[model samples]
Target: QQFLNDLDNQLWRAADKLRSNLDAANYKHVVLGLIFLKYVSDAFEERQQELTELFQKDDDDNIYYLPREDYDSDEAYQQAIAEELEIGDYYTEKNVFWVPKTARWNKLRDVITLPTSVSWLIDNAFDDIEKANPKLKGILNRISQYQLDADKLIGLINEFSKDILGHVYEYFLGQFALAEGKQGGQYYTPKSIVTLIVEMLEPYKGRVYDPAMGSGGFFVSSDKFIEKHANVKHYNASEQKKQISVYGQESNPTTWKLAAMNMVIRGIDFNFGKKNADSFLDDQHPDLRADFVMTNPPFNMKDWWHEKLADDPRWTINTNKRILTPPTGNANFAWMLHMLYHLAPTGSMALLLANGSMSSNTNNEGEIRKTLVEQDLVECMVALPGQLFTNTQIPACIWFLTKDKNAKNGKRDRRGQVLFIDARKLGYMKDRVLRDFKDEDIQKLADTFHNWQQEWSEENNQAGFCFSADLALIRKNDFVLTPGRYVG
Candidate 1:
């Protein structure tokens, strides 16, 4: 990881070499785009070594006639073996993108810095790369947009030419988000925030869904979680049943493209619908019952089709009574119900939204909160600190929900209890404007939730940080879900 940290600096610092004199204009597309190219190329060369060995083993063994008079030509055999590498299947089966010879780094690295139409060659290389691999049809083609000079462009690619993997790519996404300011940056969730969500949820197996699915961060983090737990060989995407299946829907087309590319780069299989479509207007996974749901829906969204969808069947969550429909003006409750509706009987979900969702009195959201709490669907609520998200200054909270809360699922019996953690005091400032969690913070948060759920653990309760509020006490607070109100 220290090497990765060093490489992160090496890559981004080289990217900054492109920054001088280009005062705050068009460069994100150029710098980040080439970083992705370098990653894929490095992965290609790494896998190419393995492919070479596979063919070499075939050459190491040969068959001959007993009389020694007859010899079978290796031409036919070698040609057959060589053809395997030509097909995309050979590389894709091993989770490697088949970078064509022309599009590969060794080829592009030499010519890219020469005095010529450098942008055109880089753009065409992407075009050709996309053409060779149909699954990556839309991710790479349009590279001419980045107007980069030869020297700096080559430096960008060469710096990332070192084998740095997913972390650096994600780091660049966060950096770009900050540069784009609010509108464009909101498409990316801060990695620390996403990491805490992933750690708490621990989505090891079964279907994982993110309705907003911005840049597919939830899925990528889930893949990392699985890899961290199981042996790498056991959870390969090719072994579908052994790994988590990802499903997502994004409303913005550009964000959808980014999310698709993000997943593909991780060799993670995902279904982000056929195209960009509203999760509200068009439910992509209407019939899916996800085992784990992790997402950060647009906070405090208005004009979200709440009225027309008042009678929609997803609102019919079977509690003691029918679920209350969310208001016409706001969509916080709508997103919550949508995720809950698609969750499996024993599934769990962790979601991020504005703090108001915890105890908002607007339009029956409070009543629904009470209903979910009384019905025991509520699991935990974490009050996240302000300035944690670059998208909005409004404070946010994470709500963890589970359909079944009894003793059956190997977790402790807590039919009438919900964990409330006030993590607003946790993260430290990464910069003046951005705050991130230490690994200790993430572990402390995750350990509390795990300790509460497990049969036994030395990690009990903490004052001002976490509390296990019982149904009687929560009812006294009028069923409010705010962690601060309960933690104290």
Candidate 2:
């Protein structure tokens, strides 16, 4: 821990040196952009080498095709390259970003090191990359205006090149978030929170969605989980990668760019719409029914209120009762309903919101909660520890929900009950300001949920930790979902 802190501090200092006389916003893009450039270029190079080997094997496995038809001569070969054998299509089809000739790192590394216009080179390089591939249209930071020192910029690049690009890039993102204080939290969710959500959801197949995706952390973790499952469960890599698709929407333009690049860095395919828009006002995925929906929406958005959405279709479910409208004042239930409306019948959704949601009776939120609970959509609830978020200290909780309760989705019959878990005491204080869960802590919680969902005969309950409470018990409490009120 101490060594990492020291190293982090050292890296930040070096990055600060690179920021000499440059604007903070531009400096940020410059540093992260170079890191992103190195990562994609490295990935492209690796894939290019693999493809070269396949070609050298002379169609041994038929994975590579040689144009031996009318393209036997140089002129014919050039035409064939333009028609079918081009590297751009070859790389893009395999989920790799096609790096342009000038965008390649080898071309820019020396130019960046020399005393020249670093910003111009970086700007043109990023532009060239986007121009070559449609997949990375607006994902790269194309700021060609910063006048930074040549040596310092190269020093920062050298520092990043010393380790695995993914780990270093992720570490720098977290560091940047912590440095920016509250606004930083907007672009990045805590790794622990995203980890817990992905593990609990176990989104192995089908579409995964996040309405307010912050740096695409949930998608990244879901990919990691599926890849690990592919290895341990003895499944083919290609099959696993193709089994799950990702969808997301981010309101902030800069944060949206970060999320797109974050997924591209890991070679994970996703759809974040054509442009950034508010999920509440202008939903991009109105017709998407995701198999898994994991998100961490804003704690309590006061300005999301609009008079026109009073009878929005999302809040107006066909439960036959008086469908109460989610208060326009607070957007917590608004987010919840949006996710619910977008979830497939047997799909699962896990979201993090403020603790007030567990007990608040503001406006008609309590009535809506009663309707959801009465309908048996609430699957499991977890009360997270304090300080888990850097933006606000509102005391958060995670809500795991699904529309199916009869276990028709291949799990045990959990029709009339909800699982309550009080995990406020699970995580340890990483620092005076942050709390994080250990691996065992996350596993234990997931195991408890899985056991309750799978066990057919016997009832499994952990003292003060978890409880599979019956519907009558929830009704007894008037549908309030405060985990501590029941489990404690």
Candidate 3:
């Protein structure tokens, strides 16, 4: 417990370290990526030690893969083993990726001695690193200040590496997102927002998928949730450290680094990147039938190139495309289809959308809302207020999409219901521009959704803030899932 608190605080302090000359907007991921590199290098080292033990036990096995394994055997493999920190093992013959000598955290740590020149060297290290590891190509691009020499950039990378490696990347992602304010919503959802979603979805022991993965917040929250609750009956520290794997895709390369950094710092294995993707433009993980999908897409985006997506298979569910399209070029409807289309039949999704998404009629959006309601695919909708988002002034809603609304979740029997919560009133003022939900507020929302979904409660209790509506009443109102519609 104490560890998690320190881990969360690590990123904020690192962000402060970067506030020297670089803006948090640009410096956030840069420093965060350094933190990420540290974690990966550490994890890599840990695994290397394990491999050495295995080699000693079974030298006949591929023990040469480990640098420290053979003190006097397999000269080339031994040389490879000796310079573990400096040399990269591409594993090309065996299909393994490479790590560069200069780009590794160790080399970068040795480069930076000054505070001001840290940015440039940090930038170069990534350049060197990507060339070493093709898996990371095009990822560290657009990382701001990628033009400098490694010696000069090392100072900045070293500064980020100074303290807070424990989830340092996660903290950086959240604070920087907050620093970006509403744009924070672009790559990140508030930590509490993610917590609420994780609690309701309960994504444990399976692949987690997020299409609009903003800085991997959903994935992080899900991992933490699983890590915490899995310890419900434990007092042992080591046993509780058990965790699950996460996989995701982000459209923006820079933001994808945030997700990668987010995963790396936590020491959680993940494959999150812009793998030829933009939820609207291309489907990066086409064959990914994920068990859980968690996201908060850009609300009402202006130009998602809908004009270029006239015949997408994803839009097959709704033929009149305009049926769910918003006139003001609201991209939320498209986001909904993209999310639903990617979800596995047994999977459940929790998304943060604008209030307008539930009941807008300016375009054929309202009609599309009607279609979704009639399809019975819509599970739960909660209205959160405008002030909830520090980045923008628009009010938002939470959408929970599931294959079946019933409790028969292949485990239980919850049937015939849709849960609505009007938490237009949760969260605390963090800075002047935004408010974050406290643990209590998160508890209220997450618990309500769970109690309802698990069929623990079945009533429309609204002091004008929450309600549970039936499919009949939902259709009566043209399928607008707005909290106001259900609450009032």
Candidate 4:
């Protein structure tokens, strides 16, 4: 573990040095694009090696086997093998992107010594890769456009390690987010918070959606969650792919591309719409009813409202016989109603928003909260510690909502009750400006919710830590959902 950690740090240091004339915001795409290039090229080569072995093996039962007897001689058989390796079908069939000869990492690395500029060569390579794979279209950015120095580009390319390409890609993503700080946080949610949400939601199967997916963090976490529990669930990676389908939407064009590349690098199939558009104004998946909806949208966004949304049915249809028209001044409840609109009848969702969303009475937000709790849609509310995000220092909380709360899937009938977990003091400072949840902290929070779900008992309630509130108590408190109000 330490070796891997050291390698990540060393690679980051080397890559940072290569940032020559670009800021972290602009330089991030340049580095990440190359990392993605290296990943696909490596994956293609590995698949090619496996195909070569399959073709040469004597077992005729193998679908890829090419019998020696069909060839004129040994040389002819060798020629056939070479031709077969070039077939794009073999690579695509194995979930590997087809890497043309000119686009391969080895070819690019060798071209650095040639007379042509490396940036131009990389641009053509990315173009070829995208042309060859329709799924990869619009996912790769042209590094040539950045006008980076050829030497720095080459140094960054050579500095990347071959082994653990995926790990390296993920590490660089996190590092870039840190480098970009506030703007970076717009695309990348902290990993621990994502993991905690995935753990608590337990999206074992069915459609998963993120209306405001930033870098597709929630979907990635859900994929990892399935893989981690695959043994107990009796599924492998391929099976896990089929178990949950990914649906996401992002507003920023660049951030949308980042999300697509992130999904492709992990071999996670997704539909992020034909293009990135405003989730509030131009929802991509209008007919989607997702099994799990998780996201961390911009908090207390004041400018998300549009005149077109005046008559949208999502606002009033899902609420409990009330027209919960969210005020244009604050979009906290607007985002919630949108997710709730897309949630399936039995589906569960988690949203991260500013703590004010829980009890703020500004312009109909209090009315919406009252209706949500009165209808028993609010499952649990968790108060997260400050500084968990790289963006703003606004205190955040999670709202876990479900369409159905009655007993199902071995869970107790949790009707007319809401779980409140006061975890504002749960993390340690990872650095001077950031706080992170330890693995145990995540586990404790998940376990507390799970225990409460399985059976509501005295053991599940801990003073100052957790409490299960009934509808009567919530009504008496004017429907304020803050955990502190109840847990204490």
- Quick one: best TM-score, which candidate? 4
Ranking by lDDT: 4, 2, 1, 3
Candidate 2, run of 10 with poorest lDDT: 78-87
After the best TM-score superposition of candidate 2, give how far the Cα of residue 115 lies from its true spot, in angstroms: 6.8
lDDT of 3 by residue, 211-272 (tens): 77867777767767766775574545333334345667677767776666556455456776
Model 4 scores a TM of 0.96
Ordered from best to worst TM-score, the candidate numbers read: 4, 2, 1, 3
Window of ten residues with lowest summed lDDT in model 1: 62-71
lDDT (Cα, tens digit) per residue for candidate 4, span 1-488: 45667888988898887898897878988998988888888888888888889998987577888999898999999999999998878777767888888899977776755673888888889999988999888878777668898889888878874447666777777778777765422567878888999999999889999998878878778888887888877778668678788999999888898888888888888999989999888989999999999988888787788788897877774633556766799877888899999999999999888888888899688888988888889999999886675344576889999998878888989989899998877888988867888779999999889888888876668999999889999988889888888867
Question: lDDT of all predictions, in order shown?
Answer: 0.74, 0.78, 0.64, 0.84
Residues 125-212 of candidate 1: C-alpha lDDT, one tens digit per residue: 7877787777777765354655556667666667654334677777777666666664321277776778889999988778889988
Top-lDDT candidate index: 4
Q: In candidate 2, which residue ranges exceed 4 Å CA deviation?
A: 1-13, 21-26, 58-86, 112-116, 145-151, 183-185, 319-322, 389-391, 456-459
Clashes of 1: 0
Error of 1 at 410 (Å): 2.2
- Summarize candidate 2's per-residue lDDT along 1-488 as a digit string, tens digits: 44565766777788876677765655777787888998778877777767655543555467675545635687765465444435566776777777887888866766644453666777888899887887788888776666677667767767765235555567777767666654422567777778888999998889889998878888888888887777678998667878899899998898888788778777788899878999988999989999999888887888997877878888865432346678778888888889998999878899988888989899577898888888788899998886665345576888999877665545888887888988877878888877888778888888878878877332466667777777798888888898877755
Which model, 1 or 3, shows the larger lDDT?
A: 1
